[PDB]
Amino acid sequence: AAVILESIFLKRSQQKKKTSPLNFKKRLFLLTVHKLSYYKYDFERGRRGSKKGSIDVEKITCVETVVPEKNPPPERQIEMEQISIIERFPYPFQVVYDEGPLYVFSPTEELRKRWIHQLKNVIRYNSDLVQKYHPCFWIDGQYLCCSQTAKNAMGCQILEN
Amino acid sequence: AAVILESIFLKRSQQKKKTSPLNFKKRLFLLTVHKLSYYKYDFERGRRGSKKGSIDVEKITCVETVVPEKNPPPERQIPRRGSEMEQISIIERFPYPFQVVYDEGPLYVFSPTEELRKRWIHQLKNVIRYNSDLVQKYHPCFWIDGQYLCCSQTAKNAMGCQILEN
Amino acid sequence: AAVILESIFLKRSQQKKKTSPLNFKKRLFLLTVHKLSYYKYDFERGRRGSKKGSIDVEKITCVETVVPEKNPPPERQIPRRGSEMEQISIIERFPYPFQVVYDEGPLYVFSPTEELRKRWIHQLKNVIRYNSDLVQKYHPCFWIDGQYLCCSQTAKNAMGCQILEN
Amino acid sequence: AAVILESIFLKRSQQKKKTSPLNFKKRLFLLTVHKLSYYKYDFERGRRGSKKGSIDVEKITCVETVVPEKNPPPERQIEMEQISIIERFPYPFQVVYDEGPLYVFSPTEELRKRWIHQLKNVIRYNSDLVQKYHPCFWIDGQYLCCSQTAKNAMGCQILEN
Numbered sequence: 001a002a003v004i005l006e007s008i009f010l011k012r013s014q015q016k017k018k019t020s021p022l023n024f025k026k027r028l029f030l031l032t033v034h035k036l037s038y039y040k041y042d043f044e045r046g047r048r049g050s051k052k053g054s055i056d057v058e059k060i061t062c063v064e065t066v067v068p069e070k071n072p073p074p075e076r077q078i079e080m081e082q083i084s085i086i087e088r089f090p091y092p093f094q095v096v097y098d099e100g101p102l103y104v105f106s107p108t109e110e111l112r113k114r115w116i117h118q119l120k121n122v123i124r125y126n127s128d129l130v131q132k133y134h135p136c137f138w139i140d141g142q143y144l145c146c147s148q149t150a151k152n153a154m155g156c157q158i159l160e161n
Numbered sequence: 162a163a164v165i166l167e168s169i170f171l172k173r174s175q176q177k178k179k180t181s182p183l184n185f186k187k188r189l190f191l192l193t194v195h196k197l198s199y200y201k202y203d204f205e206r207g208r209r210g211s212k213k214g215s216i217d218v219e220k221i222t223c224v225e226t227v228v229p230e231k232n233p234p235p236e237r238q239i240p241r242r243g244s245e246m247e248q249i250s251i252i253e254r255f256p257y258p259f260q261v262v263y264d265e266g267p268l269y270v271f272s273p274t275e276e277l278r279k280r281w282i283h284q285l286k287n288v289i290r291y292n293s294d295l296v297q298k299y300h301p302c303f304w305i306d307g308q309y310l311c312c313s314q315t316a317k318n319a320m321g322c323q324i325l326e327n
Numbered sequence: 328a329a330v331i332l333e334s335i336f337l338k339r340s341q342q343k344k345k346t347s348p349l350n351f352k353k354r355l356f357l358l359t360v361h362k363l364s365y366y367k368y369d370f371e372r373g374r375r376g377s378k379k380g381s382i383d384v385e386k387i388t389c390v391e392t393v394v395p396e397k398n399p400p401p402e403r404q405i406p407r408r409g410s411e412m413e414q415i416s417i418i419e420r421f422p423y424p425f426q427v428v429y430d431e432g433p434l435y436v437f438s439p440t441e442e443l444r445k446r447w448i449h450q451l452k453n454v455i456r457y458n459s460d461l462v463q464k465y466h467p468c469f470w471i472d473g474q475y476l477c478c479s480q481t482a483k484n485a486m487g488c489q490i491l492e493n
Numbered sequence: 494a495a496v497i498l499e500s501i502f503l504k505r506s507q508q509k510k511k512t513s514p515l516n517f518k519k520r521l522f523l524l525t526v527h528k529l530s531y532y533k534y535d536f537e538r539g540r541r542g543s544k545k546g547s548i549d550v551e552k553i554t555c556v557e558t559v560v561p562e563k564n565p566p567p568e569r570q571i572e573m574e575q576i577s578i579i580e581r582f583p584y585p586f587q588v589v590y591d592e593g594p595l596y597v598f599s600p601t602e603e604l605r606k607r608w609i610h611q612l613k614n615v616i617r618y619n620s621d622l623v624q625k626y627h628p629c630f631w632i633d634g635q636y637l638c639c640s641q642t643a644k645n646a647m648g649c650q651i652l653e654n
């Protein structure tokens with residue numbers, strides 16, 4: 001696999017451990033045909049750091065936008081550009097795979113749109129793409145959209161494409 | 162005072178101490194009417210880290226571009242030939258140097274784009290317009306390996322070898 | 328047209344022909360709005376001799392100083408340390424070079440004083456202000472021994488390596 | 494002898510030969526303690542050329558200004574400076590020695606004044622300094638001043654110093 005894309009995004013903790021707090025971390029994301037991985041970004045060194053997470057491309061069932069946070073904190077609100085682009089991430093999309101939704105934030109709409117599009121392309125021949133989905137965040141216990149109670153609850157909404 | 166400009170640049174060590182190496186560091190630069198200061202940038206928290214150095218604006222005697230290194234490493238190479246990168250290159254690739262000269266020596270700063278460099282040179286020009294020690298002559302090339310490439314002078318604060326006139 | 332400026336300078340051969348040597352000649356330069364021309368100076372008769380070359384003012388893309396030779400011979404050395412001479416030095420010693428860049432290459436001209444150079448650069452700037460091919464980048468150092476000292480480019484008309492900005 | 498001074502001047506033919514025309518030539522002049530010499534100036538080469546004339550310092554009886562030409566031609570009339578200084582010479586002085594008066598022109602008063610002064614100094618202990626002299630040119634036959642008829646005619650005027 002060669003790198004399809006590469007960007008720096010903010011991403012919310014997946015809280016796969018009961019202990020994990022709910023938090024956001026900046027990460028460098030790489031997209032190949034087989035995986036969507038993310039890493040610590042070594043800023044000084046100007047490089048990729050330690051791998052923090054991964055998702056097998058074929059286990060993704062749904063990549064979509066998400067309903068924006070009610071009151072983004074600065075960090076996620078809407079040429080200080082050079083800096084704003086790696087400090088402000090206000091455009092969320094979601095990557096849904098077996099475990100649930102991975103929440104990613106783009107510092108821009110274009111970047112965001114760019115990412116979804118290659119994402120779609122990559123999973124296009126998957127076998128479990130779902131045609132139902134949640135346009136919002138799962139949080140504090142439930143899917144803000146359908147109000148359901150399980151990260152893995154069926155999409156309360158329709159996706160055709 | 163208000164921050165007039167703020168950016169992330171790559172700068173070369175001023176090697177003020179004898180034991181210091183010649184290396185390059187990424188820093189957050191801010192400019193006010195008092196100083197041009199630079200800090201460690203705390204990427205993770207997205208904020209300004211500890212102050213690494215500064216120059217009092219009234220001590221600056223000259224601000225210009227510098228003739229490029231003849232064989233820069235990739236971190237300082239002009240974009241080659243073959244946008245997502247943009248977000249990243251703009252904090253990794255610094256091909257456009259400028260020099261802020263002041264009583265001590267030149268400070269060498271590298272910009273990610275030409276636009277940024279032009280911007281900063283202009284503002285720096287503005288804040289220095291009425292300084293008392295502006296020089297009319299400068300060294301267009303780096304000081305390096307013990308002397309200026311341009312004229313071979315050894316002293317970092319050797320009078321400039323080139324005049325700029327219109 | 329009227330002569331805007333007229334002086335005696337020392338210039339380097341442009342070596343347009345392969346067989347040409349790299350040497351320096353004293354010439355009478357005149358500037359009009361049409362051309363910058365240079366002639367043999369007939370000292371004896373105190374007059375302008377035969378035309379040796381010229382450049383059409385509308386073809387000029389840049390006029391600046393040049394970083395000095397690192398080891399000039401005496402004819403091009405800055406006055407050292409220890410007026411009667413003045414009459415003479417001013418036609419023998421040419422330490423202050425400038426470059427007139429145009430589509431073909433740079434023409435290198437050396438002035439006897441700094442005042443003269445400033446003068447000529449200014450007027451040349453005036454006559455070129457609205458030209459169509461002004462460049463924003465130049466080579467601050469001479470072209471020599473096959474390439475520019477500044478950036479090592481070989482082609483005499485290599486795009487400049489340095490930008491001038493305010 | 495070391496060079497006391499060195500300048501480029503215009504000087505009139507001494508016409509020491511019946512054939513010689515009356516003419517002006519630019520020359521480089523050098524002043525030492527023993528001699529006042531003059532040469533062809535090699536402009537291209539930027540050097541002294543062939544020696545054209547000389548005057549033994551001790552044979553000089555009188556160095557003085559001269560009465561300016563009635564209608565100097567341009568060349569001798571009163572920052573084109575760099576050039577004017579080696580093209581216009583409108584300040585005459587005279588160097589009188591056995592043979593008569595050598596006529597020199599300065600492109601300036603200062604230069605002129607400078608030259609007379611070192612000249613005076615150099616001949617100060619000569620034994621035939623004359624205290625009579627002609628303030629004008631000898632020409633077309635006679636000393637315009639005293640109207641006399643011999644280049645070597647006694648000074649029609651007084652010089653004390």
Ligand SMILES: O=P(O)(O)O[C@H]1[C@H](O)[C@@H](OP(=O)(O)O)[C@H](OP(=O)(O)O)[C@@H](OP(=O)(O)O)[C@H]1O
Nearest residue numbers: 012013014015016017020021023024025052053
């Ligand atoms: O660093 P602290 O403050 O502990 O918090 C971590 C980070 O947010 C992790 O992100 P990253 O892996 O990007 O560093 C997140 O992992 P994921 O979100 O990747 O799973 C962890 O939750 P768990 O998911 O429970 O591991 C959470 O515990």
Ligand SMILES: O=P(O)(O)O[C@H]1[C@H](O)[C@@H](OP(=O)(O)O)[C@H](OP(=O)(O)O)[C@@H](OP(=O)(O)O)[C@H]1O
Nearest residue numbers: 043044045186187200201202203210211212213
């Ligand atoms: O000593 P102070 O002034 O606090 O700041 C240090 C230096 O900048 C270190 O430089 P170096 O170690 O290069 O001298 C840097 O190490 P890095 O080399 O990692 O950048 C440290 O950051 P971290 O090391 O990232 O904590 C940073 O805290």
Ligand SMILES: O=P(O)(O)O[C@H]1[C@H](O)[C@@H](OP(=O)(O)O)[C@H](OP(=O)(O)O)[C@@H](OP(=O)(O)O)[C@H]1O
Nearest residue numbers: 173174175176177178181182184185186213214
């Ligand atoms: O990080 P290490 O390897 O220690 O090297 C350092 C950094 O390049 C410093 O930069 P910064 O201050 O930006 O970290 C530089 O200070 P300046 O370039 O600011 O002066 C120090 O030189 P001295 O100048 O000798 O301190 C130099 O020794």
Ligand SMILES: O=P(O)(O)O[C@H]1[C@H](O)[C@@H](OP(=O)(O)O)[C@H](OP(=O)(O)O)[C@@H](OP(=O)(O)O)[C@H]1O
Nearest residue numbers: 025039040041042049050051052203204205206
């Ligand atoms: O334990 P590993 O897997 O190496 O990675 C750690 C965690 O990402 C830390 O997270 P946290 O400390 O948030 O839990 C981070 O500290 P920061 O909080 O400073 O980002 C460390 O930064 P460095 O140690 O400085 O690389 C980084 O090395």
Ligand SMILES: O=P(O)(O)O[C@H]1[C@H](O)[C@@H](OP(=O)(O)O)[C@H](OP(=O)(O)O)[C@@H](OP(=O)(O)O)[C@H]1O
Nearest residue numbers: 339340341342343344347348350351352379380
């Ligand atoms: O006098 P010699 O030894 O023959 O050498 C000449 C002079 O330097 C010419 O200068 P100028 O014309 O002023 O005499 C120069 O022309 P330019 O410098 O004008 O071009 C000729 O080069 P070419 O350029 O190759 O002609 C060069 O061969």
Ligand SMILES: O=P(O)(O)O[C@H]1[C@H](O)[C@@H](OP(=O)(O)O)[C@H](OP(=O)(O)O)[C@@H](OP(=O)(O)O)[C@H]1O
Nearest residue numbers: 369370371372518532533534535542543544545
């Ligand atoms: O005969 P020698 O003693 O060498 O010197 C001559 C005469 O001065 C000539 O005088 P004129 O010709 O006036 O009689 C001069 O010619 P110009 O008239 O050209 O000045 C010659 O110039 P060059 O030959 O070019 O040096 C110069 O060499």
Ligand SMILES: O=P(O)(O)O[C@H]1[C@H](O)[C@@H](OP(=O)(O)O)[C@H](OP(=O)(O)O)[C@@H](OP(=O)(O)O)[C@H]1O
Nearest residue numbers: 505506507508509510513514516517518545546
């Ligand atoms: O070159 P042409 O046209 O023949 O005329 C010469 C020059 O004027 C000589 O000047 P210079 O010697 O400066 O070249 C002058 O000599 P002086 O004035 O030195 O004596 C000659 O007269 P005579 O003086 O007659 O030789 C006169 O014949």
Ligand SMILES: O=P(O)(O)O[C@H]1[C@H](O)[C@@H](OP(=O)(O)O)[C@H](OP(=O)(O)O)[C@@H](OP(=O)(O)O)[C@H]1O
Nearest residue numbers: 352353366367368369376377378379536537538
């Ligand atoms: O061939 P044209 O175009 O007429 O002009 C020539 C060249 O400029 C000669 O250059 P070079 O001989 O160096 O090529 C110069 O010789 P100099 O070398 O003496 O300057 C000649 O003057 P005189 O030589 O002074 O006549 C002058 O007349």
Ligand SMILES: [Zn+2]
Nearest residue numbers: 134145146156
């Ligand atoms: Zn839902």
Ligand SMILES: [Zn+2]
Nearest residue numbers: 300311312322
């Ligand atoms: Zn220099």
Ligand SMILES: [Zn+2]
Nearest residue numbers: 466477478488
């Ligand atoms: Zn160059």
Ligand SMILES: [Zn+2]
Nearest residue numbers: 627638639649
């Ligand atoms: Zn008389």
